[PDB]
């Protein structure tokens, strides 16, 4: 636990980016300036009870306005379905991870407020209230159950567990042995306050939004077709769109087999657009084939169709490269110089003469074997 | 692109299902915006001129005609379903249900074989055609 706390401290220290220069706008003061808000003064217990009631009402509004009347939210903020529901209603019963996190936070806040009320109702002693707060903060992931709603909170849960372990193992020494009377809850309170402050913008954005009022080939083909069709007149878009698509397909198959695409009866801008689309598709296909070959060589998980397509593309690329290399060899002539070739031939002739290798004649008309 | 004419009206799609009886009618309920439905449309275009003599494939937009996605409950981004002479044949893919394909089948040969098997089963009248594929797994390794 101490090592984990040190890790958390070192992480919060190494990432200590200095704060940015804000315009210093106070949201609370802004809402106070708004005519739709009043101001008063009341005890923290009464305000907590009012906030719990308001949160329950808000959850009821969010789970009732959506016509999902097949579920009920308990007074402990644990929403349980009323009865069975169909797949359509199951999709209608979809509770977002933001909604689940908000429900868990509201449940924790309501539990804390009710514990404070019980402390102020004479149900338990003040030391018992401190122990209850320590329980409601440390080892509260089981009670709150917010880990499933947002997995990232598990780090905060582990930090609270480490703080609880440290506080226990420090306080519970001497005459005070192991027991439930540990009421030192400031650390867990601080951790959960920080977690709530971090979580608040996301949940607020979700709630505000609720209440309002790899494929380069196909994409490029669709874009080219859309551009050609929009350029094409209505008198020619009735049936010649298929002809333009066929011309584009012929251009694509032409560049993939070193066969020139020659459409002398086509408009020059149309030919330019087709050539640009072909070049873009060739670049995308080459990049995709190189990436797939690299993944296959590394040992990535592929299928039979993907392997077949990658093998075909690689074979076509290799054939094109070999054709280009042969054309360059013809253009650049024989790589081996005449002097070097003559020297090599002289050396081979000398070696053969030293070995006295009788040449293998043409197969006679009456060869024994 | 999407050369397959999408039946915009729901009643028009239903009449199209009642239009042809001697072939296979496949309706692509996927929304044309998503890339998965784009891949499904590409696969259909691969078999557009092949299974044409034995099938009639139409596209569909769940946003245009919502009744198909609310009665048949096609919640998948791009679900391929079949209907033969007012009888929605079931393909024994093995994915728990048989109402839809629900997978972006990138293999043209697999789609052609599935279409042929569906046609054979519809001719035999089997409401649950045994798909000659192990669709229950990813079929990749």
């Amino acid at each position: 636990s101490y090592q984990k706390l040190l890790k958390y401290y070192v992480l919060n220290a190494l990432k200590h980016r200095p704060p940015k220069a804000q315009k210093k706008r106070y949201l609370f003061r802004s809402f106070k300036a708004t005519k739709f808000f009043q101001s008063t003064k009341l005890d923290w217990v009464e305000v907590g009870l009012q906030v719990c009631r308001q949160g329950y009402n808000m959850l009821n509004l969010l789970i009732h306005r959506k016509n999902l009347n097949y579920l009920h939210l308990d007074y402990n903020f644990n929403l349980k379905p009323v009865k069975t529901l169909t797949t359509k209603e199951r999709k209608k019963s979809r509770f977002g991870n933001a909604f689940h996190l908000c429900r868990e936070v509201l449940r924790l806040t309501k539990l804390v407020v009710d514990s404070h009320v019980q402390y102020r109702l004479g149900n338990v002693d003040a030391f018992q209230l401190a122990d209850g707060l320590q329980y409601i903060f440390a080892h509260v992931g089981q009670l709150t159950g917010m880990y499933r709603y947002k997995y990232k909170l598990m780090r905060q849960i582990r930090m609270c567990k480490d703080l609880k372990h440290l506080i226990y193992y420090r306080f519970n020494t001497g005459p005070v042995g192991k027991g439930p009377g540990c009421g030192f809850w400031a650390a867990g309170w601080r951790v959960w306050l920080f977690f709530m402050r971090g979580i608040t913008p996301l949940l607020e954005r979700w709630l505000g939004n609720l209440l309002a009022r790899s494929h380069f080939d196909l994409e490029l083909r669709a874009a080219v077709m859309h551009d050609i069709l929009d350029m094409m007149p209505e008198g020619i878009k009735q049936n010649k769109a298929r002809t333009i698509l066929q011309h584009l397909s012929e251009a694509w198959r032409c560049w993939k087999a070193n066969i020139p695409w020659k459409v002398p009866g086509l408009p020059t801008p149309i030919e330019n657009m087709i050539l640009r689309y072909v070049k873009a598709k060739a670049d995308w296909w080459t990049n995709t084939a190189h990436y797939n070959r690299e993944r296959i060589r590394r040992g990535a998980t592929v299928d039979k169709t993907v392997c077949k397509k990658n093998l075909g593309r690689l074979t076509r690329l290799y054939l094109k490269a070999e054709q280009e290399r042969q054309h360059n060899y013809l253009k650049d002539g024989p790589y081996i110089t005449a002097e070097e070739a003559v020297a090599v031939y002289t050396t081979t002739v000398h070696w053969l003469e030293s070995r006295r290798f009788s040449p293998i004649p043409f197969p006679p008309l009456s060869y024994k074997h | 692109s999407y050369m397959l004419p999408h039946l915009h009206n729901g009643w028009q799609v239903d009449q199209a299902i009642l239009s042809e009886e001697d072939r296979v009618v496949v309706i692509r309920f996927g929304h044309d915006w998503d890339p998965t439905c784009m891949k499904m449309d590409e696969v259909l275009y691969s078999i557009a001129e092949k299974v044409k003599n034995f099938a009639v494939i139409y596209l569909v937009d769940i946003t245009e005609v919502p009744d198909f996605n609310k009665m048949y409950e096609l919640y998948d981004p791009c679900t391929v379903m079949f209907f033969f002479r007012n009888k929605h044949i079931m393909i024994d893919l093995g994915t728990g249900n048989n109402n839809k394909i629900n997978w972006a089948m990138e293999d043209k040969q697999e789609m052609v074989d599935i279409i042929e098997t569906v046609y054979r089963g519809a001719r035999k009248g089997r409401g649950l055609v045994v798909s000659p594929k192990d669709y229950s797994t990813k079929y990749r390794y």
Partner: peptide, 13 residues
């Protein structure tokens, strides 16, 4: 025909 549908699909993507 297909031009209008293709343009509509392209404009949303």
């Amino acid at each position: 025909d297909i031009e209008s549908s293709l343009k509509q699909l392209a404009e949303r993507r």
